[PDB]
Design a protein around this nucleic acid. Structure first.
Ligand SMILES: [Mg+2]
Ligand SMILES: [Mg+2]
Ligand SMILES: [Mg+2]
Ligand SMILES: [Mg+2]
Ligand SMILES: [Mg+2]
Ligand SMILES: [Mg+2]
Ligand SMILES: [Mg+2]
Ligand SMILES: [Mg+2]
Ligand SMILES: [Mg+2]
Ligand SMILES: [Mg+2]
Ligand SMILES: [Mg+2]
Ligand SMILES: [Mg+2]
Ligand SMILES: [Mg+2]
Ligand SMILES: [Mg+2]
Ligand SMILES: [Mg+2]
Ligand SMILES: [Mg+2]
Ligand SMILES: [Mg+2]
Ligand SMILES: [Mg+2]
Ligand SMILES: [Mg+2]
Ligand SMILES: [Mg+2]
Ligand SMILES: [Mg+2]
Ligand SMILES: [Mg+2]
Ligand SMILES: [Mg+2]
Ligand SMILES: [Mg+2]
Ligand SMILES: [Mg+2]
Ligand SMILES: [Mg+2]
Ligand SMILES: [Mg+2]
Ligand SMILES: [Mg+2]
Ligand SMILES: [Mg+2]
Ligand SMILES: [Mg+2]
Ligand SMILES: [Mg+2]
Ligand SMILES: [Mg+2]
Ligand SMILES: [Mg+2]
Ligand SMILES: [Mg+2]
Ligand SMILES: [Mg+2]
Ligand SMILES: [Mg+2]
Ligand SMILES: [Mg+2]
Ligand SMILES: [Mg+2]
Ligand SMILES: [Mg+2]
Ligand SMILES: [Mg+2]
Ligand SMILES: [Mg+2]
Ligand SMILES: [Mg+2]
Ligand SMILES: [Mg+2]
Ligand SMILES: [Mg+2]
Ligand SMILES: [Mg+2]
Ligand SMILES: [Mg+2]
Ligand SMILES: [Mg+2]
Ligand SMILES: [Mg+2]
Ligand SMILES: [Mg+2]
Ligand SMILES: [Mg+2]
Ligand SMILES: [Mg+2]
Ligand SMILES: [Mg+2]
Ligand SMILES: [Mg+2]
Ligand SMILES: [Mg+2]
Ligand SMILES: [Mg+2]
Lengths: 48, 119, 95, 285
RNA sequence: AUGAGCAGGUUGAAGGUUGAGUAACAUCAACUGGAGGACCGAACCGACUCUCGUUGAAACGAUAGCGGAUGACUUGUGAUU
RNA sequence: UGAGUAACGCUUGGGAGUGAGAAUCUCCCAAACCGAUUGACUAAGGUUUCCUGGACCAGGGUCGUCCUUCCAGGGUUAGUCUGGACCUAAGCUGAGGCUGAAAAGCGUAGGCGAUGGACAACAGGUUAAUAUUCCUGUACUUACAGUUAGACUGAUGGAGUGACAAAGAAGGUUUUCCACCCCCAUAAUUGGAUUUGGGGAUAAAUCAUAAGGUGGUACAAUAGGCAAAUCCGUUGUGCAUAACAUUGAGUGAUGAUGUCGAGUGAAUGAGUGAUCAAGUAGCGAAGGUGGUAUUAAUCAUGCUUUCAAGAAAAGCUUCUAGGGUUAAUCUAGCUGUAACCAGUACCGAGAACGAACACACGUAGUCAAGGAGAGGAUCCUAAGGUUAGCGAGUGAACUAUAGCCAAGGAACUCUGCAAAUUAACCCCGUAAGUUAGCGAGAAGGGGUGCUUAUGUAAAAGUAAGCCGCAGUGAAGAACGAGGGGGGACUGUUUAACUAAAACACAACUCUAUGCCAAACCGUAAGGUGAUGUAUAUGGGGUGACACCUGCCCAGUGCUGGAAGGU
């Protein structure tokens, strides 16, 4: 059956990418908390 | 339970005896399971006794059992059987083949058996 | 010009297959930020014979030594395939 | 006139009817003039926020907007000639490709009764009472049909633009302006003296009698299924809930958003245009 | 918004041409024409029934039948509420 | 503990070899399934899973010397392919600006944004792994400079083209296919063989010729195209069976003394031999005639009909503006120089993707063989591919899947649920009712095989004869009649217990709405309605078609109203 996650290189980068998070005040706040938690994968851009 | 394997159907059984009988006639020895060797012996002996007259009717009868092997085709196996093997058993009152038991297989523990032509 | 875009020559089965039969093909590794024109210019100023054409390869980094206690990634390579004209064969070592 | 459609497809029976489009249109083929052709983007009943605003809209076919000269004031004093009457998918009334003497082309709402080769001319003088001639309301004798009425003088056409729409002149006012106009739906208004209008009735008078025969024809026209309020849940509509077919239940029918809407008047009487209305289809003012 | 798909086979509308007919219409006959939310039936879409499965092969399916299948159709990509 | 219990998730036999150990690894011969697919090319995704050698800690539902696992090394070549350096659709962003306690929302000019438009390369070979990319052969395109000859050059702007729907049927040319012919191998001990089997090819590009398709052609006046116009548009005249302009599948010649080609087939070396080596290198013949009442591809962005009336921009052509005149620019030819960035491996799924699993699920497009067949249905196979990653026995009860069952034939059961009958083609025949369209494949019947002859282009059919219990001998094909309830119908719906009488639908009616319209999203700007105008829009109710829709204005709701009381 058609499961929920259908991978797409564009949709992922354009929805949860660094530039997408850096376009609104809310996105800056989420990124600040993830830097506070020192997440190695800050966003989905750094896939590798 | 469904989508089961086809299984040991009657057609599969006839083909298995046919395949084994062609090989034992070509080479002279077969290493199979005991319960399979005990079933190919009947067909092997029956084929040999009917092939003692060497007429064209008997060739058509034998051809319903022989199959192509590595060492012989279906037409030289005919010559090998009717000119080399069968003439040897010209006055033996049956019992041209022997089945003896080997050890158990390492991975199955089934009882192996060697089927050979008794000289 | 600065000649940091010629890092290291590489010798494999493919390289030696090309490096025989009249026109020779020499495969080097170059700066991943360098362009074909820079590769031709570097070869001009440090060897002296004009390349006939240049081909480029990008080998993506991949995981190496997988399952080892500390896994590591590969290194980004740009490969350049220079082909010198008929009858000329210069040595990569010895100047 | 209208022409019936005999489907003879044995899936229900539908006495569908369509406009002839053969003896009323010059060429049956679709060959619009390229210059005055812009494409329309289907909003789908959604505003700039992307939220559905007017329900039951969406799914129409692709159309190209025909630029219509509602103002008809730029090329005044220049004789124009109708060349062909064609079909416009964005309005019920037919549109005529007219050409002016200087060589300019334009589209106008086609008055009924004109054929290929009938001369047209608009300006702000007496001119002549001929069908399609557009002049200001000061010079129109009382009694003639007029369509494409202009509300703001020097503006563009706004009133009586649909198929078979017209208006009558009912004298003047003592003010020296506000010529009387009897419009459709039995309403009398006072239109400014300088306002410009075109005489004649709009074509396609038989657009009432067209009968759709199928759901698909209406869906392709751009209408989505309208769900009744009685079939809804007790949420999303006042007339919902119930166990089976239930009546209104309230004191009066209500909108989906919860107002009475039945018989109540929803006109803002404190408008600058109230004083220019004589009757409102029911009574005085 | 922009693209793509519906193997194959039937029924033979409106309209048009000709002839008869009419004072002229109407009407009838032959030929042409190929319309239909038309018909049978694969891919495709959907999920009406029995059985099996219910710690499954599977957090909803399998076999055998079943409905639609040129359209209010199916679907890919992109956007949006 | 359950318990060494359930389970181990669709595929066989043998010979030889390696190895300490082999049903499971390698090779060979068969065998069984797929064959509108388990075959081949790719998009998306996956991200080294691809090739070679080695290993058998762990993973593989068993084993393992083996693996998509692990270790080491290696592998992805572009002026022409897919995308940028070109263009825009929905939409996004958006200096100023508008709106808003703040954060922010809306939005103009600009800028992004393919799933679309424009743009120059084809054939063969080569490595274990790449190939329109490397090599060979033959080409093409765009820039820059010099040069020769000709010409006045003409855009950031105007105009034309680009530029387009659905369905259907005719043609033209190549094909598929048929017949003949050419070439290659074969001549058969099982009864008779006088034959059997296979192949018959060549591209882009250049030149010439093109069946046709599309649309009238020149001349003259012009006030219109943010200025200008010789271009466009408009108005006249002449000629208009044609001319002129543009486009065009195919054909012939080079490309090709090339390549491919059925088949024939080594040497060298490894090895104990066979065998590998390899069926590899190399060699490599013919490489054609006619028809078609059969086929698919193209011309074709062609034509006809219908209403639901069917993208934008870039680019190309043209027009002047604007620049030249002792020049620049453009065109054609020659010579030379240059052509950037990213992807290119492999899988593409009963084992590499989305489902936690080497999970019976799901995933766009493209190529589509033979026989019979309308068919891409159905059965068997071709090219090709796999051995369903636990086996061997036995044939108890019992279960699942199938097959069959004498006499009766729904007596079973809540109910003919399920199962069973019919089934393809051809020839007869076909009622009540009706909105005259239907009902209807109504109901009910008959024939089908093989041979000879007659029929045809091929048939179909016709006549005679023969065989069997049975002749679309197997596979795939509708069970029917009658009465009633509801819904007019086709459709839609509770992903994963309810597909229905429910929803919707064409139709009827009421009500509001004169345009800065009513209604609606927001707080507002702004926007939908609508680039619409009462033959229009929104809401309530009813739900084809036909006939009807009665009484009550006391209460409630709605509309209007003089004054008077609060
Ligand atoms: Mg069988
Ligand atoms: Mg590259
Ligand atoms: Mg345009
Ligand atoms: Mg509505
Ligand atoms: Mg309900
Ligand atoms: Mg409520
Ligand atoms: Mg209620
Ligand atoms: Mg009730
Ligand atoms: Mg249908
Ligand atoms: Mg426990
Ligand atoms: Mg235990
Ligand atoms: Mg127990
Ligand atoms: Mg037990
Ligand atoms: Mg068990
Ligand atoms: Mg298994
Ligand atoms: Mg097995
Ligand atoms: Mg098969
Ligand atoms: Mg496949
Ligand atoms: Mg890995
Ligand atoms: Mg490997
Ligand atoms: Mg290995
Ligand atoms: Mg193990
Ligand atoms: Mg090249
Ligand atoms: Mg762009
Ligand atoms: Mg694209
Ligand atoms: Mg490969
Ligand atoms: Mg013989
Ligand atoms: Mg001007
Ligand atoms: Mg590849
Ligand atoms: Mg699958
Ligand atoms: Mg997976
Ligand atoms: Mg498996
Ligand atoms: Mg697919
Ligand atoms: Mg086939
Ligand atoms: Mg099939
Ligand atoms: Mg039977
Ligand atoms: Mg029997
Ligand atoms: Mg019985
Ligand atoms: Mg009976
Ligand atoms: Mg009983
Ligand atoms: Mg009973
Ligand atoms: Mg049943
Ligand atoms: Mg009936
Ligand atoms: Mg009754
Ligand atoms: Mg129904
Ligand atoms: Mg239905
Ligand atoms: Mg459900
Ligand atoms: Mg259900
Ligand atoms: Mg407002
Ligand atoms: Mg608007
Ligand atoms: Mg409406
Ligand atoms: Mg109702
Ligand atoms: Mg009712
Ligand atoms: Mg009263
Ligand atoms: Mg009141």
């Amino acid at each position: 059956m058609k499961r929920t996650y259908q991978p797409s290189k564009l949709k992922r980068a354009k929805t949860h990418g660094f530039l997408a998070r850096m376009a609104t005040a809310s996105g800056r706040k989420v990124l600040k908390l993830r830097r506070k938690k020192q997440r190695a994968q800050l966003t989905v851009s750094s896939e590798r | 339970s469904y989508i089961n394997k086809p299984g040991k159907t009657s057609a599969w059984r006839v083909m298995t005896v046919r395949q084994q009988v062609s090989a034992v006639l070509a080479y002279g020895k077969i290493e199979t399971t005991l319960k399979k060797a005990k079933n190919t012996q009947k067909r092997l002996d029956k084929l040999i006794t009917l092939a003692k007259v060497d007429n064209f009717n008997n060739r058509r009868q034998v051809k319903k059992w022989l199959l192509n092997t590595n060492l012989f085709d279906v037409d030289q196996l005919m010559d090998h059987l009717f000119s080399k093997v069968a003439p040897k058993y010209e006055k033996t009152p049956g019992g041209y083949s022997r089945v003896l038991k080997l050890g158990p297989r390492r991975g199955d523990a089934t009882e192996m058996a060697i089927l050979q032509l008794t000289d | 010009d600065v000649t940091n875009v010629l890092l290291k020559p590489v010798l494999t089965e493919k390289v030696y297959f090309n490096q025989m039969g009249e026109t020779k093909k020499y495969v080097f590794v170059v700066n991943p930020k360098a362009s074909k024109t820079r590769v031709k210019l570097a070869f001009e100023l440090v060897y002296g014979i004009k390349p006939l054409k240049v081909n480029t390869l990008i080998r993506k980094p991949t995981t190496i030594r997988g399952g080892s206690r500390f896994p590591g990634l590969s290194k980004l390579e740009k490969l350049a395939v220079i082909t010198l004209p008929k009858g000329i064969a210069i040595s990569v070592t010895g100047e | 006139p209208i022409k019936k459609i005999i489907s003879r497809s044995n899936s229900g029976i539908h006495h569908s009817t369509v406009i002839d489009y053969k003896k009323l249109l010059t060429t049956n083929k679709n060959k619009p003039e390229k210059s005055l052709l812009v494409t329309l983007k289907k909003h789908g009943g959604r505003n700039n926020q992307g939220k559905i605003t007017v329900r039951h809209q969406g799914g129409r076919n692709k159309r190209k907007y025909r630029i219509i000269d509602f103002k008809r004031t730029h090329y005044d004093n220049i004789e124009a000639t109708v060349k062909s009457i064609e079909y416009d998918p964005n309005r019920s009334c037919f549109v005529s490709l007219i050409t002016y003497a200087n060589g300019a082309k334009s589209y106008i709402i086609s008055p009924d009764g004109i054929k290929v080769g009938d001369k047209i001319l608009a300006s702000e003088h007496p001119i002549d009472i001929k069908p399609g001639f557009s002049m200001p309301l000061a010079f129109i004798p009382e009694g003639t049909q007029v369509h494409n009425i202009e509300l703001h003088p020097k503006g563009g056409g706004q009133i009586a633009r649909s198929a078979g729409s017209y208006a009558r002149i009912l004298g003047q006012d003592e003010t020296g302006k506000y010529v009387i106009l009897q419009l459709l739906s039995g309403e009398t208004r006072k239109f400014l003296k300088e306002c410009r209008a075109t005489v004649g009735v709009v074509s396609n008078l038989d657009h009432n009698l067209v009968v759709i025969g199928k759901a698909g024809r209406n869906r392709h026209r751009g209408i989505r299924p309208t769900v009744r309020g009685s079939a809804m849940n007790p949420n999303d509509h006042p007339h919902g809930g119930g166990e089976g077919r239930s009546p209104v239940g309230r004191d009066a029918p209500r909108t989906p958003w919860g107002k009475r809407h039945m018989g109540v008047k929803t006109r803002n009487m404190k408008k600058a245009s109230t004083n220019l209305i004589i009757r409102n289809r029911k009574g005085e003012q």
